[PDB]
Nucleic acid binder design. Structure first.
Lengths: 272, 50, 119, 158, 93, 195
RNA sequence: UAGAGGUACUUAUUUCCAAACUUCGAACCUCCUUGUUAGGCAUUUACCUAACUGGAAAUGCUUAAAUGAAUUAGCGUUACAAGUGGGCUCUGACCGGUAAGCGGUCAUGGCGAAAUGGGAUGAACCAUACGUCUGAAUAAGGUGCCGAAAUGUACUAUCACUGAUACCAUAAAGGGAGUCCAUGUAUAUACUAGGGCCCCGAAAAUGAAUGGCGCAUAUAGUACUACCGAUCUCAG
RNA sequence: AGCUCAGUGAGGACAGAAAUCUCACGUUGAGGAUAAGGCCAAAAGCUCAAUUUACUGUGCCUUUUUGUACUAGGAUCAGUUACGAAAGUAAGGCCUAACGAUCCCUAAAUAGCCUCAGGUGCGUGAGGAUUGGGGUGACAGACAAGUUACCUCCGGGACAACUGGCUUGUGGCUGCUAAGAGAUCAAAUCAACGCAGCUUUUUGAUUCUUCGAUGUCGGCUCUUCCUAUCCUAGUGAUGUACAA
RNA sequence: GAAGCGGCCACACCCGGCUGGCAACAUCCAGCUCCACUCCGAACCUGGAAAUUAAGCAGUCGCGGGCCACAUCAGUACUGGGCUGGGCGACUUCCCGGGAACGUGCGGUGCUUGCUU
């Protein structure tokens, strides 16, 4: 029947990958060259804009590495965008750009440098801008990707991200794809844009809403200053507690009870 | 013709007659080190005395 | 003690009683003063060396040995090494330990039996 | 056939322990060094750019230069008669912060804790110091288990 | 080994990279007006054989190929050296 | 032919097996290590009878095949290939060497070609066994007396307490069998660890 | 090596191995630290940082409290020059060799260049390393006589043209109702687990050497005192 | 930047032990120019695409200082390019071998920097400083075939032939064991396969003694010694009837 | 409790069962532009939201394989000093020191850095 791969000799020999390599979330060859700084700069922070896109949410952060672990300085998240205007389509391309503006303008209002670095930057006797690097992650770096949508939001927000590079931006290409289903197929418009009809925003409105989204983000960027954080964290456990409790651990006494009742069927008790 | 190739019998004896600890003059070695660091370390000293 | 473990074949040693620590220093005791190996003679020798350390006369020096008080190593360094003659029984076997029917190494209390006849 | 190569007689030096193959964690690159710092050189077998020699494995030194990826380390090799100094350059992935001084630095701060707090009450100070392991005070011992060990009669058991 | 007939290279005099037509270096035949040669001519005259040595026990059959990176902006050659080669080709592709 | 085995008794080098490096090696005199009723049992042949060596030295392959043939032919004569089980518990892996000599270049380039296989014994290494029934324990001891004169040095013949070739005493064997912890493989005893 | 279980392979086992195998891993080694350590203050910089009432580095000021293992010891530096560049060796570790008073390495010691005493005799082993003398008590080693000192006291073995003190001057596998001591069983007796000492195994050429004489309680082991004995030790 | 290899397992027209296709497991056993050993899995492997950092210039470090060099490698500074969205990476090949003095010649400068001693000379020509190449494998680097029995000299027991010594593989001699020969029957007599010794009457091995010389093979002649005894003296066994 | 970002990198891995989805993660639905398949909207990319916890993920169970921990294993193996100890030898008593491994027995099977609803 051929060789059994996976003996004791296999599993004893087997080195594991780290953890977030196993869970398959970080490339550690990226990360080790994202973090590194020259030893002549010593203990100096350099910031990195994380911008990972799940389904529904576009997440965007600014991170400093430390030996204990990474530390977010400021965060923004596309489920906040209902407050500023954008009710639906929270992983659009224009939704990804809108989070880019939030991460910029919140970070600069925390550091108290809002009057400086208003527009994009594009050189002496002038204050140098924030170096913030892009962490993409395992998402593939192709042109017109939603990772670089978050980048363009951060650059137009304020921050000097280095790169080499207004359609797709105020709701175009969404708005054209509405018209192709609306005009021809009609059945498919009900499938594809169910929620949109429900509001209903319509094809034309996408251009209008985003501009006033970019107005309101630039005016009132920071939000939800909650304290203390401990009593906030306690309320979330009660608020989001499964109705059905998770199975809990059997103690060492009641395990040996159940072991023996199985062993009574096949004989030779009791022990372990 | 064929005589001995080497020995270490009484290497130890000779070394211990005198293993003198050669002391370093100073910890900086300015032939080495970064020039960009030492360049600035000159302009620290030059600016101070004026 | 761990130094004495290395050198156990070369030495006999033990734990002397107060009558033996006395009788060495009165008879054979000498002061190594300024690297001179001077004989102890009179108590004005050891007042001048050791009076600042509160050891006035030879009774106070002997006390500082057998009680092992705070200025022991001052009082021990002050004493020159003793010089003994080979004892009037002889002794059996240089090159075996006392424990295996010989001489060298630790003999605990019975060093007093050896030193009596070395003196 | 004795050979004088660079990487010679290092079969087991530059081996990678066991279940510790691969590149190191990126926490290692985030660490920092200074001039005057005591550091021990032990090698990553994987990372080949900017190794030390075989000889300066397991060898303490002091940092004198620091440079973008690498640290100039002063280490005292024993030559023939005399102990020479050797100016190494070596990368940070073969270099760790040594815990030689951490016994000494613990005591100095522990002494200042004692020397100040004696004066705060004040009162009057006893002086602590290090001392080798010393012979015991007399004391009294009651056990209530006493076995009686004896040699048994010998039997072969094969 | 094969080598490109044009490649980019740091012109030492212009102080920047610029493309330059490469060629194999000229082994010059010695002139007789050379000072070293003149000493030899006078010394070889008279009697007493050949004077200075020539190397009889010459083993190795190889030669370090120096190239001549003749620049186009600068107009000045700057000689690069490869390792030692048994044969040397031009790239055709 | 051969050297006298007083040449190659005591061990004056590191062990030198058949490998990539040794190359030009002749195969050993032994092929069969084990004779008699090989397919038997622990319970069928409980009584065991060992030959222990009382020296640290080399044993030749030629000795071990001489000892097998003298063992078999006595046990064949008495009881007649039924009860007994003979086994040899040395395997010759060490290779010997010769400088040859047989004008001449002696002691120059002294390393020599392999001559024969050998087994390196250790003080109290068993170099033979006979497992049998209580009827022919008498015959087993008389066999191993004859096999002892084949081997170098001096060597004790011993009746073991333990069953078969298993590491279990007769007292322990009934307790484990009764407990049911131990089990029977085709040959020998396989323990049950309850895991 | 050799069986069993599955569909020659294969899943568990087993007999037994590796200087150029390693999933574990000592002893012996090796390297660093052990007095100044915590700060605070403000000048300098063309360097670093998004920024300076930051970082990095060196210049000074100064706020606290002490000399914070053992044992030993003065430490640092320079100049000029001799001889040498055949080594040998005990005890352990090791490579090659059937082995060698053989060849090639390693660690401490020794000889070479180290007397004296002891091993009868010996470069190397043991005690110990030395001015010229006079004593005492010892070391190694010895105490029938040669030969200075007990054929000492107490306790066990031994008959043999035999035995007799490290290195060492050769003897093995294998036998013995020789004698002494002895393990387990069976019925004073039969059967043996063995151990010492003694005997056999054990044959070379000038006549021959426990050093000799000789001994048989001057042979083989064990214990405890007395005693002789070096240029060591101690006293003058 | 993307992907995962070797292999095993099952499948799939012709299709077979091996063609191409598919899924599953797959810690790296494949592959990384070659020796051997390390090292490596969203790579250092394989594929695709764009490229020339296999670049220029001076110090520094390690191998190696009880001997400083060259080779090879390493960390920088000062430039400049390549590639990438970027942090960055690149100073050849994943890491350890792949190579070389003076003198002389020779090449590099759009044709440059200094000198040609009476000219701050004018063409040609020559000579310099700085950086590579041409080469020495005996690889710190002379330019080099034999023979001597016609031989000479200096020395060497630092080194052979020769006696002795140590050693005993080889030669010779003897034990222990028996697996059988011996009609039958292991031990009257032989004795395997094994194992343990002795001998210095063979030949080796070694280089301690002898090279300012122990006269070297055999025979002839005379002495003495050893026994591992062929005969003679005396004894025991037997497949010892007698004799041999 | 869930999610992005991580630290030590199997007490976290690997096989197989069971119990959960308010939001969140995900499967999933669709293919027009950005761009993607040396063929394929499977992947990658972009725009969704109908219905599900079947899978991933989370918690938990197994006289589970492995991994980790303690105790035995064992004063064994080996080893640094010392003897005018033994032994033809090979090796090895003893005195002053240090001291494993495999195996077996019982236990366990991730602990939380900074931001967010």
């Amino acid at each position: 029947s051929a060789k059994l791969v996976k003996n004791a000799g296999y599993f004893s020999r087997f080195q594991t990958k780290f953890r977030r390599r196993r869970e398959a979330k970080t490339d550690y060859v990226q990360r080790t060259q994202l973090i590194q700084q020259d030893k002549t700069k010593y203990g100096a922070a350099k910031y990195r804009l994380v911008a990972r896109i799940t389904n529904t949410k576009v997440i965007a952060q600014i991170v400093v590495a430390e030996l204990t672990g990474d530390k977010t300085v400021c965060q923004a998240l596309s489920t906040e965008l209902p407050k500023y205007g954008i009710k639906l389509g929270l992983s659009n391309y224009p939704a990804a750009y809108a989070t880019g503006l939030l991460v910029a303008r919140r970070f600069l209002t925390q550091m108290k440098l809002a009057d400086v670095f208003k527009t994009e930057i594009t050189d002496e006797e002038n204050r140098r801008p924030f170096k913030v690097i892009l962490d993409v992650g395992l998402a593939r770096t192709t042109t017109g990707a939603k990772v670089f949508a978050v980048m363009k939001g951060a650059v137009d927000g304020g921050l000097f991200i280095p790169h080499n590079v207004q359609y797709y931006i105020l709701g175009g290409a969404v708005a054209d794809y509405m018209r192709k289903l609306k005009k021809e197929s009609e059945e498919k418009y009900n499938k594809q844009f169910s929620r949109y009809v429900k509001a209903g925003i319509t094809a034309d409105n996408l251009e209008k809403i985003y501009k006033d989204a970019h107005a309101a983000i630039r005016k009132n960027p920071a939000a939800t200053v909650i304290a203390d954080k401990k009593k906030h964290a306690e309320e979330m456990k009660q608020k989001h507690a499964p109705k059905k409790p998770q199975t809990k651990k059997l103690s060492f006494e009641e395990k040996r009870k159940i072991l023996n009742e199985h062993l009574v069927a096949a004989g030779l008790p009791p022990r372990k | 013709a064929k005589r001995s190739n080497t020995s270490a019998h009484n290497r130890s004896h000779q070394h211990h007659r005198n293993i003198h600890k050669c002391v370093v003059k100073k910890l900086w070695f300015e032939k080495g080190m970064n020039a960009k660091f030492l360049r600035n370390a000159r302009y620290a000293k030059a600016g101070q005395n004026k | 003690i761990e130094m004495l473990k290395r050198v156990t074949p070369q030495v006999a040693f033990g734990y002397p009683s107060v009558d033996m620590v006395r009788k060495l220093i009165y008879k054979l005791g000498t002061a190594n003063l300024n690297g001179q190996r001077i004989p102890i003679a009179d108590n004005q020798i050891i007042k001048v060396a050791l009076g600042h350390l509160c050891i006035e006369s030879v009774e106070d020096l002997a006390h500082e040995i057998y009680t092992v008080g705070p200025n022991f190593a001052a009082a021990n360094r002050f004493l020159a090494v003793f010089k003994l003659h080979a004892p009037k029984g002889g002794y059996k076997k240089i090159n075996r330990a006392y424990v295996e029917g010989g001489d060298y190494g630790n003999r605990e209390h019975l060093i007093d039996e050896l030193i009596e006849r070395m003196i | 056939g004795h050979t004088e190569g660079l990487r010679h007689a290092t079969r087991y030096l530059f081996a990678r322990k066991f279940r510790k193959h691969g590149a190191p964690a990126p926490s290692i690159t985030l660490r920092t060094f200074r001039i005057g710092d005591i550091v021990d050189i032990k090698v990553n077998g994987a990372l080949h750019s900017g190794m030390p020699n075989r000889v300066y494995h397991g060898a303490t030194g002091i940092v004198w230069n620091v440079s973008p990826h690498a640290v100039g380390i002063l280490v005292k090799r024993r030559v023939n008669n005399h102990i020479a100094p050797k100016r190494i350059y070596v990368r940070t992935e073969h270099v760790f912060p040594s815990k030689s001084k951490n016994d000494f630095v613990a005591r100095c701060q522990a002494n200042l804790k004692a020397h100040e707090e004696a004066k705060k009450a004040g009162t009057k100070i006893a002086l602590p110091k290090r001392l080798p392991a010393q012979p015991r005070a007399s004391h009294v011992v009651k056990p209530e288990l006493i076995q009686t060990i004896t040699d048994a009669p010998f039997r072969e058991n094969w | 080994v094969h080598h490109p007939k044009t490649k980019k290279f740091f012109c030492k005099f212009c102080k920047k990279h610029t493309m330059c037509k490469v060629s194999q270096a000229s082994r010059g035949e010695e002139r007789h007006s050379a000072l070293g040669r003149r000493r030899y001519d006078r010394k070889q005259k008279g009697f007493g054989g050949r004077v200075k040595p020539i190397l009889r026990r010459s083993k190795k059959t190889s030669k370090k190929i120096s190239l001549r990176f003749t620049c186009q902006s600068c107009k000045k050659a700057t000689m690069y050296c490869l390792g030692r080669l048994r044969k040397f080709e031009w790239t055709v592709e | 032919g051969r050297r006298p085995a007083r040449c190659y008794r005591y061990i004056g080098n590191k062990p030198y097996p058949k490998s990539r490096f040794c190359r030009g090696v002749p195969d050993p005199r032994i092929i069969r290590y084990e004779t008699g009723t090989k397919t038997a049992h622990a319970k069928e042949l409980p009584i065991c009878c060992r030959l222990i060596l009382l020296e640290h030295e080399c044993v030749s392959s030629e000795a071990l095949e001489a000892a097998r043939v003298s063992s078999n032919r006595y046990m064949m004569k008495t009881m007649g290939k039924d009860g007994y089980h003979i086994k040899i518990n040395l395997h010759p892996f060490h290779v010997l060497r010769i400088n040859k000599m047989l004008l001449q270049t002696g002691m120059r380039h002294a390393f020599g070609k392999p001559e024969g296989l050998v087994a390196r014994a250790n003080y109290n290494s068993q170099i033979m066994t006979i497992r049998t029934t209580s009827a022919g324990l008498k015959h087993a001891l008389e066999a191993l007396r004859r096999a002892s004169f084949k081997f170098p040095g001096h060597s004790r013949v011993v009746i073991s307490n333990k069953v078969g070739f298993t590491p279990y005493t007769f007292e322990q064997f009934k307790e484990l069998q009764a407990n049911g912890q131990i089990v029977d493989c085709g040959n020998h005893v396989k323990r049950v660890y309850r895991r």
